[PDB]
A paper describes a structure:
The Rep proteins possess two related catalytic activities, a type-I topoisomerase-like cleavage activity in which they form a nick in the (+) strand at the origin of replication to initiate DNA synthesis, and a religation activity to join the ends of the parental strand that is displaced during replication.
This was then used to aid the structure solution of two staphylococcal Rep variants, RepDE and RepDN (containing the 21 kDa fragment of RepD fused to the 14 kDa fragment of RepE or RepN, respectively). Constructs of RepDE and RepDN spanning residues 35–314 were used for crystallisation studies, since the first 34 amino acids are predicted to be disordered and had previously been shown to be dispensable for protein function. Crystals of both RepDE and RepDN contain two molecules per asymmetric unit as a non-crystallographic dimer and the final structural model spans residues 39–308 for all subunits. RepDE and RepDN also contain an additional all-helical domain (helices α6–α9, residues 237–280) previously identified to contain the residues responsible for recognition of the ICRIII sequence at the origin of replication, conferring specificity between the protein and its plasmid substrate. Mapping these residues onto the RepDE structure identifies a potential interaction interface for PcrA helicase, at the open end of the catalytic domain.
Author numbering:
A (entry chain C), B (entry chain A): 39 to 308
Write the structure that this text describes.
């Protein structure tokens, strides 16, 4: 099946006037439905819309690193058009120099992705979190502080664990691609380095089968131990087997929704 | 070789008199070499001995929730006996209802553990950090917020990275066992489910067996694919195949030093 694609995180960074800092800082105090803390003249923190939007202004720490001075963080999937409108008009518009610092692509699949893994053509570090059952629930590829980082994890299990409403499907895995800094401008075709795979052996139904192959694939000597009637069974099986690459479906769904997603971005920049 | 064993973290929780709170609060203000903050009559925070001991008193929280009102945190390995003496006499003695809330066992080995297979018989979450190499570097069994949590990792590499004094040995790996809450009283046998092995699948004369193992020891996920009754068969087999199990050396060193360590604890309680 084709995976559903959406943006799942947007950070927007800008710069805010001395005038506007106060103005905005003043505005927000008057609204009890927004929560303010860690206030000074150069600093302000806030969550808005039932805690769905984080907002941080810091002048003293913006300039100390020569950067822009205000972040706004939120998940667009969790905002209602009304809300999106509210946030743009009452916050984003008063920012200048504004662009995207973070942007996350979320591909939901109704298959089981436990055995899938990402590779860039560059050699990267991996982390896998296994459940009590011994199965893998979350996978990290690369590092979170970088232009591109990929999670592959059991959304169903994670939603269940998060006490979210239960879901009709028997399997649900996400592939999140966190694009930061300069990579955000390439979101619309990011897959040149990257492939999301599942091995040869993984595709078999039978644990003993998949072990036996894996061994044959990794220790040449293993053929020498095996009887001829057996050798043929596994020669058959080897040829019968292909590695799977979801990349292609992803690129497809991406292309299919490029224009909507693109508009959905442009919304914030006007 | 036998691994050196030591405690690598202690917290101690207690209650402090109105009289002693002040007495102690008074004492600390006079000493410039201790850093005091967040002070009231019912509150204080402090770091002492060149920032190596954290100390926190809160009465109003303690009254608000029916709890003990003071914690003292430190690593005993990083204290000099002189220092240990100072802390007991000038702080701990003045506590009552005092016991241990955290206790960490650190087994250092001069072998390379990369080449062992580490496993718990118990069903708990595993985290494995893989290197760019594809091989596993660090393993966590359990979660940090729990009665018992285990790290296995390259101490030499971690010490080097930490700009610590270099070490004569070519290899140095730690096995840290963080015991919290009620588990602290069972420090003398907290790792019996844990096994660290060196199996050679080859010596199994049956061939599906050897594949299955080889896979288990090279793809952690494949435990997830085994029904519960099967997992035990292969756990049996693993242990049955390895001449070496470092667990045994740990249990030994532990027994050998149980009495000293025990005294080293009793030191704090008098």
């Amino acid at each position: 099946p084709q995976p559903e694609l959406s943006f799942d995180a947007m950070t927007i960074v800008g710069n805010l006037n001395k005038t506007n800092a106060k103005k905005l800082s003043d505005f927000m105090s008057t609204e009890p439905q927004i929560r303010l803390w860690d206030i000074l003249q150069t600093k302000f923190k806030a969550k808005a819309l039932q805690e769905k939007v984080y907002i941080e202004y810091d002048k003293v720490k913006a300039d100390s690193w020569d950067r822009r001075n205000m972040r706004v963080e939120f998940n667009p999937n969790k905002l209602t058009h009304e809300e999106m409108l509210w946030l743009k008009q009452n916050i984003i518009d008063y920012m200048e120099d504004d662009g995207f610092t973070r942007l996350d692509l979320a591909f939901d699949f109704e298959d089981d992705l436990s055995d899938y893994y990402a590779m860039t053509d560059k050699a990267v570090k991996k982390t896998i979190f296994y459940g009590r059952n011994g199965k893998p629930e979350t996978k990290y590829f690369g590092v979170r502080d970088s232009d591109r980082f990929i999670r592959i994890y059991n959304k169903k299990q994670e939603r269940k664990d998060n006490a979210d409403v239960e879901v009709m499907s028997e399997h649900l895995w996400r592939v999140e691609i966190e694009l930061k800094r300069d990579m955000v401008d390439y979101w619309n075709d990011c897959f040149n380095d990257l492939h999301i795979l599942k091995p040869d052996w993984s595709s078999l139904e039978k644990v003993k089968d998949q072990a036996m192959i894996y061994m044959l694939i990794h220790e040449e000597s293993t053929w020498g131990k095996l009887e001829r009637r057996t050798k043929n069974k596994y020669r058959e099986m080897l040829k019968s087997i292909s590695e799977i690459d979801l990349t292609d479906l992803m690129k497809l769904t991406l292309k299919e929704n490029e224009k909507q997603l693109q508009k959905q971005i442009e919304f914030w920049q006007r």
